[PDB]
């Protein structure tokens, strides 16, 4: 986690909706908004790993 | 670090108006009832200053 690489998730719709509601990690945090406000949002990709 | 501010409300404050709640918000996921938990959490923080 201090020396991995990451990629991008692109063109594909982004379900930050349920992402929000489901319980899928024991904790999650963010830079910008809540991820209900996500769920409205778009970017070229989303940087991930 | 005494500085209070207000990260969530149910609706954005008129003009001039204010409001001393505090509270613990839930984000639809479930009524918590004024306890902390996924999804609920107290709407005031103070800076890191």
């Given at each position: 986690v201090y020396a991995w690489n990451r990629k991008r998730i692109s063109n594909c719709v982004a379900d930050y909706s349920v992402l929000y509601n489901?319980?899928?990690?024991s904790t999650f945090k963010c830079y910008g908004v809540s991820p209900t406000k996500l769920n409205d949002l778009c970017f070229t990709n989303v940087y991930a790993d | 670090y005494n500085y209070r501010y207000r990260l969530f409300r149910k609706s954005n404050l008129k003009p001039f108006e204010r409001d001393i709640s505090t509270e613990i918000y839930?984000?639809?996921?479930?009524?918590?009832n004024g306890v902390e938990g996924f999804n609920c959490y107290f709407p005031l923080q103070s800076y890191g200053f």
């Amino acid at each position: 986690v201090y020396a991995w690489n990451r990629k991008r998730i692109s063109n594909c719709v982004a379900d930050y909706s349920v992402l929000y509601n489901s319980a899928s990690f024991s904790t999650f945090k963010c830079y910008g908004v809540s991820p209900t406000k996500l769920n409205d949002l778009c970017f070229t990709n989303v940087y991930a790993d | 670090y005494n500085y209070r501010y207000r990260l969530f409300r149910k609706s954005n404050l008129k003009p001039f108006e204010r409001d001393i709640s505090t509270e613990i918000y839930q984000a639809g996921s479930k009524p918590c009832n004024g306890v902390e938990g996924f999804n609920c959490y107290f709407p005031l923080q103070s800076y890191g200053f």
